[PDB]
Amino acid sequence: SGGALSYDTEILTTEYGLLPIGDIVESETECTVYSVDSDGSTYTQGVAEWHDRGEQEVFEYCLEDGSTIRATKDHKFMTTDGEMLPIDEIFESELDLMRVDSSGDTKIATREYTGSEDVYDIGVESDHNFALSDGFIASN
């Protein structure tokens, strides 16, 4: 099933620190975003995949830091073990998220629903994972 990120979601990038996921799909750029290698090393990828899933009922995942992730449970993220799992399972099994070139929580504190809005998703053909600002390392 089609998992996607909210249009308000923001990428972790070399061009500005911050860019909205909306700009990547609706203005078709290839700006370098953070990702992981097969050897579990942090690197960058210019975007090669962009898609619009329309309108979906979005979920809010709160961190201990008070920050919030906004996505669907339908797409699989990955832990520090290199094991691929949905954000919803990483929450209720309390699993550690993968490290990145920014300070962030590994465990999610809370889960809530928030209403339907514009949703988007992005990737690359090799490693197919992306780092978000106030968000988990997305994968599909």
PDB file of C-alpha atoms in Angstrom:
ATOM      1  CA  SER A   1       0.000   0.000   0.000  1.00  0.00           C
ATOM      2  CA  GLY A   2       1.169   3.586  -0.759  1.00  0.00           C
ATOM      3  CA  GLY A   3       2.934   5.136   2.260  1.00  0.00           C
ATOM      4  CA  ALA A   4       3.818   8.842   1.926  1.00  0.00           C
ATOM      5  CA  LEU A   5       5.012  11.901   3.949  1.00  0.00           C
ATOM      6  CA  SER A   6       2.993  15.137   4.643  1.00  0.00           C
ATOM      7  CA  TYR A   7       3.486  18.202   2.342  1.00  0.00           C
ATOM      8  CA  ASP A   8       4.648  20.167   5.472  1.00  0.00           C
ATOM      9  CA  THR A   9       7.520  17.603   5.930  1.00  0.00           C
ATOM     10  CA  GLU A  10      11.078  18.994   5.648  1.00  0.00           C
ATOM     11  CA  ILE A  11      14.260  17.225   4.306  1.00  0.00           C
ATOM     12  CA  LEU A  12      17.795  17.192   5.877  1.00  0.00           C
ATOM     13  CA  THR A  13      20.002  18.643   3.055  1.00  0.00           C
ATOM     14  CA  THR A  14      23.338  20.292   2.064  1.00  0.00           C
ATOM     15  CA  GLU A  15      21.677  23.135   0.032  1.00  0.00           C
ATOM     16  CA  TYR A  16      20.034  24.907   3.056  1.00  0.00           C
ATOM     17  CA  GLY A  17      19.888  22.450   5.975  1.00  0.00           C
ATOM     18  CA  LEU A  18      16.081  22.639   5.349  1.00  0.00           C
ATOM     19  CA  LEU A  19      13.913  22.147   2.187  1.00  0.00           C
ATOM     20  CA  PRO A  20      10.174  21.114   2.099  1.00  0.00           C
ATOM     21  CA  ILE A  21       9.296  17.719   0.470  1.00  0.00           C
ATOM     22  CA  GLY A  22       6.686  19.641  -1.598  1.00  0.00           C
ATOM     23  CA  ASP A  23       9.487  21.559  -3.428  1.00  0.00           C
ATOM     24  CA  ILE A  24      11.272  18.301  -4.392  1.00  0.00           C
ATOM     25  CA  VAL A  25       8.161  16.813  -6.128  1.00  0.00           C
ATOM     26  CA  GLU A  26       6.381  19.993  -7.376  1.00  0.00           C
ATOM     27  CA  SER A  27       9.676  21.612  -8.611  1.00  0.00           C
ATOM     28  CA  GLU A  28      11.488  18.362  -9.600  1.00  0.00           C
ATOM     29  CA  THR A  29      15.001  19.088  -8.154  1.00  0.00           C
ATOM     30  CA  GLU A  30      17.916  16.707  -7.286  1.00  0.00           C
ATOM     31  CA  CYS A  31      19.403  18.423  -4.144  1.00  0.00           C
ATOM     32  CA  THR A  32      21.746  16.222  -1.998  1.00  0.00           C
ATOM     33  CA  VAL A  33      19.903  14.694   1.012  1.00  0.00           C
ATOM     34  CA  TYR A  34      21.387  12.423   3.703  1.00  0.00           C
ATOM     35  CA  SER A  35      21.200   8.579   3.383  1.00  0.00           C
ATOM     36  CA  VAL A  36      22.999   5.340   4.520  1.00  0.00           C
ATOM     37  CA  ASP A  37      25.365   2.994   2.587  1.00  0.00           C
ATOM     38  CA  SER A  38      25.166  -0.856   2.698  1.00  0.00           C
ATOM     39  CA  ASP A  39      28.162  -0.694   5.143  1.00  0.00           C
ATOM     40  CA  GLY A  40      26.072   1.532   7.510  1.00  0.00           C
ATOM     41  CA  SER A  41      27.977   4.789   6.784  1.00  0.00           C
ATOM     42  CA  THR A  42      26.235   8.202   6.477  1.00  0.00           C
ATOM     43  CA  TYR A  43      26.414   9.784   2.973  1.00  0.00           C
ATOM     44  CA  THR A  44      24.463  12.018   0.473  1.00  0.00           C
ATOM     45  CA  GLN A  45      22.223  11.401  -2.576  1.00  0.00           C
ATOM     46  CA  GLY A  46      20.740  13.824  -5.087  1.00  0.00           C
ATOM     47  CA  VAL A  47      17.035  12.914  -5.594  1.00  0.00           C
ATOM     48  CA  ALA A  48      16.095  10.642  -8.578  1.00  0.00           C
ATOM     49  CA  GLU A  49      12.467   9.578  -7.710  1.00  0.00           C
ATOM     50  CA  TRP A  50       9.400  11.809  -7.033  1.00  0.00           C
ATOM     51  CA  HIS A  51       5.682  10.873  -6.603  1.00  0.00           C
ATOM     52  CA  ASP A  52       2.259  12.192  -5.380  1.00  0.00           C
ATOM     53  CA  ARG A  53      -0.189   9.835  -3.518  1.00  0.00           C
ATOM     54  CA  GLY A  54      -2.923  12.521  -3.392  1.00  0.00           C
ATOM     55  CA  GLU A  55      -4.733  12.974  -0.057  1.00  0.00           C
ATOM     56  CA  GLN A  56      -4.252  10.524   2.868  1.00  0.00           C
ATOM     57  CA  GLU A  57      -5.250  10.570   6.565  1.00  0.00           C
ATOM     58  CA  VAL A  58      -1.917  11.433   8.242  1.00  0.00           C
ATOM     59  CA  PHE A  59      -0.460  10.258  11.598  1.00  0.00           C
ATOM     60  CA  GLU A  60       1.515  12.372  14.121  1.00  0.00           C
ATOM     61  CA  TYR A  61       4.437  10.671  15.921  1.00  0.00           C
ATOM     62  CA  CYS A  62       5.765  12.816  18.824  1.00  0.00           C
ATOM     63  CA  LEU A  63       9.380  12.660  20.152  1.00  0.00           C
ATOM     64  CA  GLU A  64      10.645  13.159  23.747  1.00  0.00           C
ATOM     65  CA  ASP A  65      12.227  16.374  22.307  1.00  0.00           C
ATOM     66  CA  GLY A  66       8.556  17.591  21.709  1.00  0.00           C
ATOM     67  CA  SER A  67       9.102  17.501  17.875  1.00  0.00           C
ATOM     68  CA  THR A  68       6.636  15.725  15.482  1.00  0.00           C
ATOM     69  CA  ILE A  69       6.862  13.336  12.475  1.00  0.00           C
ATOM     70  CA  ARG A  70       3.866  13.381  10.018  1.00  0.00           C
ATOM     71  CA  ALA A  71       3.415  10.318   7.738  1.00  0.00           C
ATOM     72  CA  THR A  72       1.326   7.162   6.991  1.00  0.00           C
ATOM     73  CA  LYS A  73       2.112   3.757   8.620  1.00  0.00           C
ATOM     74  CA  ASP A  74       2.251   2.120   5.118  1.00  0.00           C
ATOM     75  CA  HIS A  75       6.007   2.564   4.297  1.00  0.00           C
ATOM     76  CA  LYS A  76       8.997   0.852   6.025  1.00  0.00           C
ATOM     77  CA  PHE A  77      11.760   2.807   7.800  1.00  0.00           C
ATOM     78  CA  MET A  78      14.886   1.112   9.345  1.00  0.00           C
ATOM     79  CA  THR A  79      16.554   0.730  12.780  1.00  0.00           C
ATOM     80  CA  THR A  80      20.235   0.903  13.903  1.00  0.00           C
ATOM     81  CA  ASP A  81      20.326  -2.916  13.314  1.00  0.00           C
ATOM     82  CA  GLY A  82      19.771  -2.442   9.536  1.00  0.00           C
ATOM     83  CA  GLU A  83      16.300  -4.062   9.922  1.00  0.00           C
ATOM     84  CA  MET A  84      13.471  -2.530   7.797  1.00  0.00           C
ATOM     85  CA  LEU A  85      10.169  -1.775   9.677  1.00  0.00           C
ATOM     86  CA  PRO A  86       7.195   0.697   9.595  1.00  0.00           C
ATOM     87  CA  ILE A  87       7.289   3.859  11.786  1.00  0.00           C
ATOM     88  CA  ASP A  88       4.208   2.540  13.628  1.00  0.00           C
ATOM     89  CA  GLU A  89       6.085  -0.664  14.726  1.00  0.00           C
ATOM     90  CA  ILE A  90       9.293   1.285  15.626  1.00  0.00           C
ATOM     91  CA  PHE A  91       6.942   3.261  17.943  1.00  0.00           C
ATOM     92  CA  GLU A  92       5.093   0.406  19.770  1.00  0.00           C
ATOM     93  CA  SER A  93       8.131  -1.997  19.854  1.00  0.00           C
ATOM     94  CA  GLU A  94      10.183   1.101  20.976  1.00  0.00           C
ATOM     95  CA  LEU A  95      13.034   0.357  18.499  1.00  0.00           C
ATOM     96  CA  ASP A  96      16.131   2.545  17.918  1.00  0.00           C
ATOM     97  CA  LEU A  97      16.239   4.586  14.684  1.00  0.00           C
ATOM     98  CA  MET A  98      19.471   4.722  12.608  1.00  0.00           C
ATOM     99  CA  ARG A  99      22.030   7.558  13.331  1.00  0.00           C
ATOM    100  CA  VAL A 100      22.491  10.657  11.066  1.00  0.00           C
ATOM    101  CA  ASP A 101      24.542  13.929  10.650  1.00  0.00           C
ATOM    102  CA  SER A 102      22.035  15.680  13.072  1.00  0.00           C
ATOM    103  CA  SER A 103      20.996  15.307  16.780  1.00  0.00           C
ATOM    104  CA  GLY A 104      17.674  13.432  17.138  1.00  0.00           C
ATOM    105  CA  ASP A 105      15.676  10.856  19.113  1.00  0.00           C
ATOM    106  CA  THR A 106      15.857   7.112  18.392  1.00  0.00           C
ATOM    107  CA  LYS A 107      12.589   6.272  20.314  1.00  0.00           C
ATOM    108  CA  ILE A 108       9.119   7.783  19.535  1.00  0.00           C
ATOM    109  CA  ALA A 109       7.186   9.065  22.618  1.00  0.00           C
ATOM    110  CA  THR A 110       3.537   9.281  21.311  1.00  0.00           C
ATOM    111  CA  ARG A 111       1.043   8.414  18.442  1.00  0.00           C
ATOM    112  CA  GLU A 112      -2.029  10.442  17.225  1.00  0.00           C
ATOM    113  CA  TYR A 113      -4.235  11.079  14.096  1.00  0.00           C
ATOM    114  CA  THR A 114      -4.566  14.649  12.687  1.00  0.00           C
ATOM    115  CA  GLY A 115      -6.711  14.791   9.468  1.00  0.00           C
ATOM    116  CA  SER A 116      -6.314  14.238   5.686  1.00  0.00           C
ATOM    117  CA  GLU A 117      -4.067  16.562   3.569  1.00  0.00           C
ATOM    118  CA  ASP A 118      -1.563  16.618   0.603  1.00  0.00           C
ATOM    119  CA  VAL A 119       0.999  13.741   0.701  1.00  0.00           C
ATOM    120  CA  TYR A 120       4.308  13.177  -1.134  1.00  0.00           C
ATOM    121  CA  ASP A 121       7.256  10.710  -1.441  1.00  0.00           C
ATOM    122  CA  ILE A 122      10.855  10.755  -2.773  1.00  0.00           C
ATOM    123  CA  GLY A 123      13.784   8.315  -3.308  1.00  0.00           C
ATOM    124  CA  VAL A 124      16.853   7.120  -5.307  1.00  0.00           C
ATOM    125  CA  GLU A 125      17.536   3.887  -7.243  1.00  0.00           C
ATOM    126  CA  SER A 126      20.604   2.573  -5.241  1.00  0.00           C
ATOM    127  CA  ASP A 127      19.962   2.910  -1.437  1.00  0.00           C
ATOM    128  CA  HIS A 128      16.351   4.294  -1.541  1.00  0.00           C
ATOM    129  CA  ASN A 129      16.367   6.026   1.914  1.00  0.00           C
ATOM    130  CA  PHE A 130      16.188   9.770   2.924  1.00  0.00           C
ATOM    131  CA  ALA A 131      16.788  11.834   6.109  1.00  0.00           C
ATOM    132  CA  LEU A 132      14.084  14.295   7.324  1.00  0.00           C
ATOM    133  CA  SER A 133      14.359  17.456   9.510  1.00  0.00           C
ATOM    134  CA  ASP A 134      12.370  16.679  12.708  1.00  0.00           C
ATOM    135  CA  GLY A 135      11.752  13.200  11.217  1.00  0.00           C
ATOM    136  CA  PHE A 136      12.894   9.580  10.874  1.00  0.00           C
ATOM    137  CA  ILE A 137      15.078   8.103   8.013  1.00  0.00           C
ATOM    138  CA  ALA A 138      12.344   7.428   5.435  1.00  0.00           C
ATOM    139  CA  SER A 139      12.379   4.340   3.145  1.00  0.00           C
ATOM    140  CA  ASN A 140       9.870   2.629   0.776  1.00  0.00           C
TER     141      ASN A 140
END
